[PDB]
């Protein structure tokens, strides 16, 4: 069978990151019996040797001499850290001279909540490890590549990354579908960067059989989070009900779970009667042996439900679930765990067109094959079947502007503008919210001073009427929305726009250059903080402001925007689609509901830019358009099944 | 270097079509190096025994024995013809039993003219040839490898196919891309039927170095045409803007080119100011040793340009260019034709971002490999590198309503509607027309009398008012629409629903049967027919209405539609993306310039349709906005080359 591998890739080296388990051992493993000289790359050192081991053993078998020679490890090799990156590079430089194929399959599945359980820092951690690593490892091995005259730099991406023109959600996972969404973006953009000499594409593979599924795996950990996460939200849910329809608070209704006892709960009297039919569900539905199905909740859940109800906005102290008595093992049974797994695995097989899973060898045979192929660049390889879930399009210019009903219920308004470089857009849309449609404030949240005193300036008339609010974020943007909801009131339309512009720097360098000027690695860290974990923070915490309706707006392009700028911001839109599209789905799951959209300011070409103040001025009144149609209210009784979905993780193109 | 071919493909029987010569002749070869059985189709018998010869004689070369019974060939195999496509599959089964991979290869460039310029009849030859030859060849090989137990499908698609959520326009090409585009569309829909037995893809190689390309090749007839259709559409607008501002009838206009001398009518004091300019940027323009400066055109330029004319609606002798002056040889010098062909060729090599060509070795090289995937279905492969060409994202959701200026515009217009079975959708839309927006009068262009009936009594009330008409069309949809014009006028808003509902037969048989319920070669022809070609002809003819805004309808999908009608619904929504987008590039290359765009009544899941009457409410009212936003007036000040583009060519979904 390895026959076929032989000479395939005879003469070159590849740096494998994940590379002692997984698809990333197979594709090494593969790589090595094609001819190929391979660095593997993790974290553990006995499972590296373990792998090293194995691919010397079958090289040989398979007549190979030297074979320590063609397989090297490099242990202690987190992905997430810089340093560790820089050290990777040196120890695989030294050991066989300049990379080939660098094969950036490291993947970590990430945080695994929803965007509103999900801590800041985790969020950034996966971006680190599964996107900026990616970008970092491409920054110091593509100046040897091009000066040789030829290289390869494969992302190991998933079909949960979505493709070119479509996001796909992926609920729980959000962190995670926007370092897959970001690897494939970068293949796409830095393609014509890279060519003629350095091919950059990306692979998509679907649900693949192994460890990382089988294990505590994927599906196991994913049937534990259903039932957790289906505590949480319904808790979270009642609670808030309750509080529309009760007089005490929160606090007080929080005390009502204290005895975290089901069944006096539902027996209460004095509980309301969202608590009592909780209660009362809570007990049909459960496992008898389950000491969920008699208690309400364990300090893990009642952490996170605390957290949710404090970045809400409710006033509870931080030891209220101090002496919550610890319900016995096991909260949820083997058996609950093990039917909600095998639920997980059989609708994943009925949506695979073969229905059947791939093997790690089946995908790393494919992309082996693949990777031979001289002639493809800025393409996203899908070697196994997709999946059946919903694809939404994205970048549709041909729109209009909300019903007349729907403007007219913007009179009176509170609403809520992010923003600093875009002046002239915001500048606009305050007047549009104030002028046209009756809005009774705007609070505009900038990040400096100076910032706050352009914005005065521009807006001097409707400042001195105390129509325009103005407050400073610098890197608090949560605690800026806080003191704009204690100060002003909770928002309906708010508009994330970015603070920072896009850099203006190379993105490659020249053959015989240093690369120094060229875009750095932390230059990419940076441009993923404030164009991508900036809209996260602000829709983490919008997502629980009921009524709220958000537009995440992208960085901006213009007919004399350098290519660079281009490609950065074709780079951002894409990545940010995944984020938009699983967001908007984990709303329906929530109690408040929110709309949450993205209004995109980038084009894929510089031809279908305005090039006269005519066309610019169609642009900023579509750009308006584009704000009113997203951030209009959707009334409750128009917010059908039917109607929800098709405003909620939608983007436009202006 | 065919070492790693060796048994990759052992024990496999291939039909290739278009297997004597281009990338086809180079599959056929790779699969026969990789122990496979290929049968190689084609029309001319010399070019495919020496194909035959040289595969016979590389495999002798490697080492195989009976070279003569591993590759076969089948003459005198045009894939247009049904009947030559019924005596392949039964001269591949008798000389090798079932087939493993049918490789849908072959594929025309078509008819190489505008839309408007383009007969129905080789439209169709184009679908005949490229498309419906691949379904027919699925349905008579599907039953054997389903019973077998495995199979494989692959259509050789192109990059100018589009994508999955993308149409990419081929101006020129629209039968080209139109077939292409539905070859992706059939692997994307028939997967999950066709699992997990067999395997369906395609593949979309972006420009290939050979033959085809190189030659008269496809750069040099591509050079030729930028020439003609240059000089055609100069002279068809320049007729038309004269005839606005002049006095004298389009015959007495199209008299002053008898002569067919450029200098003269430059000359000609009687001679309108837009024809006089025509000829001074004719001769300032002009290669001297071409006749084409000294002469406004032959009589193949003459003939598209009369058939423009006649099918507009103007009255012409059809010998008015009987005694034309046929212009001395060359028309077109080479100077000329070459320095366009290498402007085609130098543009595309900019777009590449490997900025190289692949050859067709390449290609086939790449597919073969692909092809031992086995854990990969609904999917298009790109085996080479595509252009920058631009996308049209299809399926955008989230859109308004125009704004109530454009809206008032609709106020005394004339619209007209065509369609049978939409029965609700044309009722409902015709009302909102007349009672809502004041239009003057509604004509409803029906396919039969039963059709034209219901219709009548539906809309009773307006029937008797005066404000709404019936056309009976039938098969003469174009003299209908001529029929329209006379009576009524030229039409401001013209809808395109199908006349036909889809089909509810099974796409795929049961393992053990005949297949004999399965849908036929016939209806797939008839599928294409009313719900491709039925659009095409339209909008052929609507292009040459001025002042005229065309929206094409796709079939309706429901909560209660078979998953057979969902498949081929989201089969013809793809597929009719490529047309809308094509055309809608080509409009701007004529003097009337109208709206062409797509409104989708299909979607991709179940779960996204109304499920109640609320629900069914809402969606209809979308589908009136959706058609609104697509038919109100563009005003000719807001025409921009930037709004032009942004009103032209997309998709939005109901
Ligand atoms: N599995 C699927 O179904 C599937 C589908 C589509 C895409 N993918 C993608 O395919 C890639 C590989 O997936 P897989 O299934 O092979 O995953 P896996 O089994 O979790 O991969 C584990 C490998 O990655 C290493 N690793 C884990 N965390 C690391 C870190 N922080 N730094 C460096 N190395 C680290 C592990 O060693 P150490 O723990 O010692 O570091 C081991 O070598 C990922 O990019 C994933 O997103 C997977
Ligand atoms: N070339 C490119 O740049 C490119 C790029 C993307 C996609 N493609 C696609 O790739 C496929 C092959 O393209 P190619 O470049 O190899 O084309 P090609 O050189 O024109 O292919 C010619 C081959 O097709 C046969 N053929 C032509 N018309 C036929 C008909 N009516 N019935 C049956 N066989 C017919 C020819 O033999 P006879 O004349 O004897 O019949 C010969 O075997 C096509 O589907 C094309 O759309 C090509």
Redesign the interface.
Known sequence: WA??????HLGKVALITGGSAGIGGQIGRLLALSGARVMLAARDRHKLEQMQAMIQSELAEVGYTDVEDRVHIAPGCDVSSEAQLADLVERTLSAFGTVDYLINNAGIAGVEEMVIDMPVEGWRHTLFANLISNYSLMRKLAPLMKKQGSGYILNVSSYFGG????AIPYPNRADYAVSKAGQRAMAEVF??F???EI?INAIAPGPVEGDRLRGPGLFARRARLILENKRLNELHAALIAAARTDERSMHELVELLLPNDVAALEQNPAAPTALRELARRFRSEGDPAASSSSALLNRSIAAKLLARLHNGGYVLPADIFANLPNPPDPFFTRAQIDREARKVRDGIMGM???????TEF??A??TV??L????????T??????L?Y??T????????????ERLAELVGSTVYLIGEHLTEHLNLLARAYLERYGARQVVMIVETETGAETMRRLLHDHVEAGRLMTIVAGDQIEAAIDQAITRYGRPGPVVCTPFRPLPTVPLVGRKDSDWSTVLSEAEFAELCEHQLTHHFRVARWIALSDGARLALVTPETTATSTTEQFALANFIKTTLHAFTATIGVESERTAQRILI?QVDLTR??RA?????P??RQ??LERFI?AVL??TAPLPPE?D????G???RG?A??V
């Not at 695979?352 to 899973?357: F, G, S, V």
């Open positions: 026959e076929s591998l032989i000479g395939l493709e070119k023109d479509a393609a014509r890279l060519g003629p091919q695979l067109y073969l229905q059947r899973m791939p089946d995908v045979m494919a094959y693949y031979a192929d001289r002639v493809v660049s800025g393409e390889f899908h070697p196994s079947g997709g059946r919903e694809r399009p994205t970048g549709g210019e041909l729109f209009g502007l909300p019903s007349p959209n894929r070409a279908e830019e305005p090039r006269d005519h066309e169609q642009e358009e149609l997203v128009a059908t099944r039917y109607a979905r098709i405003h939608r436009i193109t």
